[PDB]
């Protein structure tokens, strides 16, 4: 009983450790913005 249970539990822990290693260890326009800011600043100037 003790040996079977211990061996199976050890194997399961080993599998989880492998999966954890798998997850962790594996290392891997501008012009439109111009008129956008121009309209924003002129709108604020008018509204201020």
């Amino acid at each position: 009983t003790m040996q079977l249970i211990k061996n199976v539990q050890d194997l399961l822990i080993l599998t989880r450790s492998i999966k954890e290693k798998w997850l962790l260890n594996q290392i891997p326009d501008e012009k439109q913005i111009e008129e956008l800011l121009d309209n924003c600043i002129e709108t604020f100037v008018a509204e201020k």
Partner: protein
């Protein structure tokens, strides 16, 4: 049919000790009515012979101390077989007999006397009688193992496991 082992069998005879009392003189007389005293032993035959005649280290110490013990040899040397003889005595409460069987091998070529072979152990403690240590040891060990099994199964029931920690309580 369930039989209590004779090794643990203990006889008490309050009437006999009340009437006669405990003494080395009648210790064999006390033993006579017990179940352990076989009726086929030559001691009983000697007893009926005496009755019919009337109608018509410490071993050497107890050897030389009593004359009835002498008469026991000179009446027992003639009859070979299962016989009851005293082992040792310390007064006024402790007596033990020696349970041996005799085969008087008078054949040619044997310079030794009659062969004496043990058969059983008997201890007279007070008014009580007691009659293998291997069995005692194995019984104690097996009961210990049973208790250990109970404790370990209870402890394993108490055990709780989680993958992220191991086993805890």
């Amino acid at each position: 049919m369930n039989v209590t082992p004779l090794d643990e069998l203990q006889w008490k005879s309050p009437e006999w000790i009340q009437v006669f009392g405990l003494r080395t003189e009648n210790v064999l007389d006390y033993f006579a009515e017990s179940p352990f005293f076989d009726k086929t032993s030559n001691n009983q035959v000697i007893k009926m012979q005496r009755q019919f005649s009337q109608l018509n280290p410490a071993r050497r110490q107890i050897l030389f101390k009593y004359p009835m013990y002498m008469q026991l040899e000179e009446e027992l040397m003639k009859l070979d077989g299962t016989e009851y003889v005293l082992s040792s005595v310390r007064e006024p409460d402790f007596w033990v007999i020696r349970k041996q069987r005799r085969t008087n091998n008078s054949g040619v070529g044997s310079a030794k006397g009659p062969e004496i072979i043990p058969l059983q152990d008997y201890y007279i403690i007070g008014a009580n009688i007691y009659q293998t240590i291997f069995k005692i040891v194995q019984s104690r060990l097996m009961s210990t193992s049973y208790h250990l099994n109970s404790t370990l199964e209870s402890l394993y029931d108490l055990i709780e496991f989680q993958p992220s920690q191991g086993v805890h309580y």
